[PDB]
Amino acid sequence: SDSLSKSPENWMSKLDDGKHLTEINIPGSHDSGSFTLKDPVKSVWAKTQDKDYLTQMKSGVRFFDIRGRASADNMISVHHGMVYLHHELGKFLDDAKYYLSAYPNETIVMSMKKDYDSDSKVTKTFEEIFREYYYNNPQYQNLFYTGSNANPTLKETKGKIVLFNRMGGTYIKSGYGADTSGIQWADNATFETKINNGSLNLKVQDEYKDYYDKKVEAVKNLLAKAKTDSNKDNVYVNFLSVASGGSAFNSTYNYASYINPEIAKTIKANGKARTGWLIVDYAGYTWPGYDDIVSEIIDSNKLEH
Numbered sequence: 001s002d003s004l005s006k007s008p009e010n011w012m013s014k015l016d017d018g019k020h021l022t023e024i025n026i027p028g029s030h031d032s033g034s035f036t037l038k039d040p041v042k043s044v045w046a047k048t049q050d051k052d053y054l055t056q057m058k059s060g061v062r063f064f065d066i067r068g069r070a071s072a073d074n075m076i077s078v079h080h081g082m083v084y085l086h087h088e089l090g091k092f093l094d095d096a097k098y099y100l101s102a103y104p105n106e107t108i109v110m111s112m113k114k115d116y117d118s119d120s121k122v123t124k125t126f127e128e129i130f131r132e133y134y135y136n137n138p139q140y141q142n143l144f145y146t147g148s149n150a151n152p153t154l155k156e157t158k159g160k161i162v163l164f165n166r167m168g169g170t171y172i173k174s175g176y177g178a179d180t181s182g183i184q185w186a187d188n189a190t191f192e193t194k195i196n197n198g199s200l201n202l203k204v205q206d207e208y209k210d211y212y213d214k215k216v217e218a219v220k221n222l223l224a225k226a227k228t229d230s231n232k233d234n235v236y237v238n239f240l241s242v243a244s245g246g247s248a249f250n251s252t253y254n255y256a257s258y259i260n261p262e263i264a265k266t267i268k269a270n271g272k273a274r275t276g277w278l279i280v281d282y283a284g285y286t287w288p289g290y291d292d293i294v295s296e297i298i299d300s301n302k303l304e305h
């Protein structure tokens with residue numbers, strides 16, 4: 001009997017798959033695709049991960065914050081705002097497909113958001129392109145969750161990607177926010193909004209411009225709410241990440257190196273409490289002598305069965 005965080009490649013397999021994904025404490029990666037950046041000056045503000053998708057997944061990351069730009073009427077490139085990340089969306093999809101084959105009792109939650117203006121030559125909306133060339137593309141048949149449950153369990157989603165829709169209104173009908181209203185997302189804020197035709201209450205802390213100390217308080221205030229809430233119809237998404245700023249090199253990495261351990265320590269002190277889904281920069285990046293945020297999120301899940 002070892003800690004779940006001792007097997008991060010297949011920790012969701014150790015859970016009771018009757019759980020709703022909402023009741024699982026899931027580590028996510030912010031701006032997941034940005035691991036390919038090498039330029040040092042650009043990486044200060046634009047790079048948020050050093051591991052690739054398969055290595056994030058092996059370290060136990062199950063929520064991926066994929067940001068896209070429409071490069072052609074049939075193509076979505078992964079971006080951080082203006083910055084091209086050097087791979088297209090099919091790349092993440094192939095990695096997830098492969099990972100889910102090898103670890104069939106895990107599920108992956110994929111947040112999809114438009115992060116920059118489409119190429120000139122594009123004539124289609126980003127949502128249409130995603131819908132027709134990825135979600136409904138026969139090439140990724142069976143890969144996505146296509147159920148009609150607004151609050152799906154681990155059993156119904158494992159081995160599949162569940163869409164977390166940050167595209168706005170969509171004609172896709174499966175996954176979080178998959179309706180023609182989409183998710184009302186407040187800018188730089190802690191907020192709450194109903195999604196899936198009012199079936200779920202989404203509670204978000206996404207104050208991405210906060211400085212160190214304010215950010216930690218914002219993450220801790222939403223952690224304290226999740227701890228008292230056992231309602232499976234509430235979903236918590238808590239971003240520990242922040243935009244860079246302070247000196248020429250107060251990078252996203254520097255913020256993560258302070259935020260991650262502090263929040264990791266707090267979750268460890270809390271024991272088995274519900275945390276929600278915590279989305280972090282530099283997932284899996286450890287520092288000698290400090291607690292590891294991804295491991296602490298994983299271990300905060302209480303087993304009983």
Ligand SMILES: O[C@H]1[C@H](O)[C@@H](O)[C@H](O)[C@@H](O)[C@H]1O
Pocket residue numbers: 206208239241243
């Ligand atoms: O860069 C910010 C930050 O990455 C937030 O986490 C994301 O929710 C915002 O929409 C984005 O503009």
Ligand SMILES: O[C@H]1[C@H](O)[C@@H](O)[C@H](O)[C@@H](O)[C@H]1O
Pocket residue numbers: 050284285286287288
């Ligand atoms: O990915 C990182 C990186 O390789 C660091 O150099 C190492 O010191 C960390 O502990 C590791 O988590």
